[model samples]
Target: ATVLLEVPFSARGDRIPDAVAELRTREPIRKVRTITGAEAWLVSSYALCTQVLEDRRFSMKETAAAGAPRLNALTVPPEVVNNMGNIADAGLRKAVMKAITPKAPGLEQFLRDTANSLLDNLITEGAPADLRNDFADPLATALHCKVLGIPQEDGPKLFRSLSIAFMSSADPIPAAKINWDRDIEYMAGILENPNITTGLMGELSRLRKDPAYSHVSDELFATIGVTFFGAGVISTGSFLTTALISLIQRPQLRNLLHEKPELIPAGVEELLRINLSFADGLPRLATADIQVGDVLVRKGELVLVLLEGANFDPEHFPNPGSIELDRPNPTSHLAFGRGQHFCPGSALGRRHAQIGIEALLKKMPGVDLAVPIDQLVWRTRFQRRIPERLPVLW
Candidate 1:
């Protein structure tokens, strides 16, 4: 059995690539121990990863029926977690999709405005500002709040609660539970309130009335919004921060994008591939024996597929380790994941990243690391990939 230690546990150590690379070369489908004392299979091959993602035998929904192996026992109900494969009811998914997708036209304009406003604040604060708090986190959190109709003033408090709640640590579970309970209570209150119109509470009400979406219970509707708000804010913020570090690390590439602004879209795709965030494959507990690659995965076993490893597979992309901004078919990278669980928020996330990068280049073309690389702090949490403080100055 191999245990894929969660993110916070891995982040305290050196860059994870060395161990990950060793595993990929020597044992693509290998056993590893988790910090939580659980052992699971780690699938690292590109083909194997895809097979696991698409395969029906590795049922996430059925894992709970037989007491699946879990590093953390906090069970997120199926309604909240929404196993991607089991979303068979097309109408319910479509309603949620339509709500989020059609809203994209306004989201783009929101991203531009949010980035500019944040840049203005950063410039006014003078040099050596922490991008996590100043630029990345705020912009992302603000965007989520705006899209969901949460008031701007509530962004910081809500973010603080959420950051602590979803952190990848053993101790945070109790506090995280409390924060989440309080968050749900607040969301429920919002749903009950007649005055609130800007957020998902209102949207859920609308969805509830539609005969086509009668299957979407109040709990499911609330779950979707909560998940969206949490992921929309945190993941995009971390990715943006990570992407900025990548930009600073390669001045030549940064200058190239700065020179030809038209390349930003392609650059965003490349950055998504290169800047690894969130472990590639989420742990799946197999309900039935299945073959992945040459290995026969037995029932009641855990399997983790490394998304970054797949993206970096040389067979899939030439010189997989390096960033090639203009590379075609970069969607092969599993940044937002793939298959049924593919991140629905990807379209919005990309827009945010693309627009944010464009604004950064236009407004702060010469911005560079103001502090030594060693001095900057990277977050150790498994759930978030970000620098604690991206201190930068133009």
Candidate 2:
């Protein structure tokens, strides 16, 4: 009998306990077909999660392999996907690295200035403002523009277009694909054109011409632009929203972190661990038979490493449900994944989370949630986990 596995398409954090517990005790590796009719194995355990992430059997290059489990026709093309993988490539990665590299010394200052600017604008406008919209969203968009060489003036429009292009609606996929292709082509043109110059794009252009960096290709350069413009902004923006919502919900933790400024970075690590950001970590389709607990996953099956589940595993983390002030191994968590596929922007992401959180706490020491706990909204059916708005008052 095929065990009919039931999972809410949009499961809530509070509701994950039962599912996670069941998996831990009985079905560490279980199978069920997704709504899209593709078979998937949901692996839920820290050891198994790490093994799957590090195992060569599970490959991200699904399209290259025949009979691999595919999510879709890959709304984006092979070159686009190649860029995502090669982001870890030393040289190409370095080109984009310069934009953020040696640390955006000016970056931290810019973030502090920007966060304060947004907070000031919010206060001037009124209290009980939506932090997600009024502060987090705008701040993230601005950072995205600054980092990607996109103009601050062009941010809102680009953000809107990108948002629409990535929406989850069925019909939206075609439109989204079109917008994405257009964006990539536009980015490519910017990279190829010598007349236009400035920002990260200019930096990459300069790198391509340099004798030392001549190895970097136009495709790689374009990839850097796309990666920076898309993932860079989205993750930071969503993390900001998630972090704010997290703090607002747990006022005690908020106060604790606030009082002990040193706890800020650890708190960010805990947030990355405990919070359900990317619902299923980067989807990995198995390339060979791999065992997780008793279940054996075959080639051509989709395996999703539940990020929150692994991070919250009681074995790996004591008192898994609660947040820890001084987590001994903050960088050890797989929030950025393990092995080669690890997130390249991890350092920048950490800085953003740390500086952004500290900046908020330092500037608005008295800021508190305006709306009731139950009244807070949560985003649904979206890959990025965050609230729609986090209304706050001082």
Candidate 3:
């Protein structure tokens, strides 16, 4: 019997689901059926979402356990469900962590140059340029390739994998497995390429030769390249794309940031709070019997921490829809929340959007939507909510 509220209330990147507020207000911790037939608890309130993430008993790793009710079918191999944990075990966590930090030499300078170059084309090309196609993805893909020390031109090849890689299907995705093998082959091939003498892949290649890392599996090394590039590009590119929608929707706000410039950081923080960047609620499996908001969630049950629910919950932000730069504790929102199960790329993700927005305001301060809001096509059943093409004019 198909009889429960299914997730992904809306696939449109521009609109938050109306039910988010209704559900949070009435039943902050409630059960909802996943795309899979299995029912799982959806934790929405900021308090419960934070509680689930902070408690060690709610295991992100266990969500991938055999036959576990899934939030979405995995794009990577089952064992890679917890890449950070596995990387830690492989003893490459330090190298991987250091590689993603935004402070790498000339990183900000690189972002500015690349972002400005993309904007130059938008200017040269004239009005109604697509920000998503021509700018955001290319900018994000280039940044990721630069960080990985892969040929930046190779970005388009890796970018193609993500469309299939980030599925939220009810059943196993055969296409995902096919692309995984293809990308891993590409990654392994390039890891040995002589031109890759720096960046994350270079550092990992150096470690592969070390006697210490010999015990680490080849699959893990190759998986890092495929997953990192795919996930990073998807995350930053989509977030920035949707965030741009918010900016274009509010011309005065965009104008203010353009005038002050310094307020851009605060404005970006506010954007992070309210943005529906992540499409799926994060998944965790209860490791033991625990009472959460009156439900006795037993051991091995899948739990979803809905970030949009928490971010848009009116009680927490008073008025979650409005972006108030002066709002105290603006960073409390879980746009990047994982607590100990943290997003490893948080620093890099933030800088990517911050610089992208900054450059946009400086170079194209008059940017606005060229089409009606409904004309935009939103990506569906994907890990992040974003427009297929964000057409804008200045």
Candidate 4:
């Protein structure tokens, strides 16, 4: 009989209980039933999660195999899945990385300016604003535009399409397909424009001229574009919003950040470690029998590297429950993942949060949550704990 643990295990207020700590100690690798009713090997220890991620025997590509256990009914279209798989393809991954990696000489200033502009608008609009909407969402969208070389004016429309296609849907499959098709159409329109001679999209278009990238098809390009936009904007936005919430809830921490601005980067990593983003863990499939600890994950079995559990593992992180700004190896957290599947946009995400948080603090010196600490609502879907509306007042 499989032991069942209702994932995301409930949170007491903003803090999630150390629900998996006991599991980590006793059964680092154990079979558990997910909310979707599928059974999987839940990997909780930091060492095992790192091993699973770094080992070639475990594959994200295999997750789409027949009868693979899924965490939810939410279906990713085959095109998107194919695009994700291509990240492991050497030539394709290289081309995609070159296109999406933040490399502009002025990238930091651009992010800072974008954050300042959004903060300015919020200040003008007055208080009781939802920071997720008024600040983080737009800031992330604009940053995505800057990175992709899309016109800033198109950011909101692009973001809407991305949100519908990737983030929300009434029916997962059909709605996702329709919105994805619409997003592809939008990208196609952008490619047709003569003005789009640079940026990630343009670079992707230009890649076709090179024999190395000749295999890149229109659908593949569209998939790549959608994948970058979908993952980049929402995840980064969630991190920024959650980071703000943490600062708002802890006045001393906020004041410390203000006092010692140099520690902001370390603070960002600490924030990433504790953030509820990716609480569900990154999913993978075993291609061969592998020993994760005392347990065996057979070939074709779904394995979830429970990142939250791993990050909080007491063996690797001392005083795991507490957020330590000065803690050594803050970058060791799996928030961006590890090995070949490590998030390509990680540098961009980090810089965005660092600059965005600095700008928010500098601009809104007294900003705090509009609602009481206990009153803030969080989204409960798919074990992801994101704020539905982060209301704030300066």
TM-score of each: 0.90, 0.89, 0.97, 0.92
How many residue pairs clash per model?
8, 1, 0, 0
Q: What 10-residue stretch in candidate 1 is worst by lDDT?
A: 6-15
Residues 117-173, candidate 4, lDDT per residue (tens digit)? 888888888898888988898888888887777788987876775444443222345
TM-score of 3: 0.97
Query: Candidate 2 vs candidate 4: which has greater TM-score?
Result: 4
Best prediction by lDDT: 3
Where does candidate 3 have its weakest 10-residue lDDT segment?
Answer: 1-10
All candidates' lDDT scores?
0.71, 0.69, 0.88, 0.76
**Winner by TM-score:** 3
Error of 1 at 312 (Å): 1.3
What's model 2's lDDT at 291? 73
Error of 4 at 101 (Å): 3.9
- Candidate 4 off by > 4 Å: 1-3, 11-13, 82-90, 161-172
Q: What does the lDDT read for residue 172 in candidate 1?
A: 25
* Ten residues in sequence with the least summed lDDT for candidate 2: 163-172
Better model by lDDT: candidate 2 vs candidate 3: 3
How far is 227's C-alpha from truth in model 2 (Å)? 2.3
- Residues 179-220, model 3: lDDT tens digits: 889999999987778878778899888888899999998888
Ranking by lDDT: 3, 4, 1, 2
Question: Can you tell me which runs of candidate 3 are displaced by over 4 Å?
Answer: none
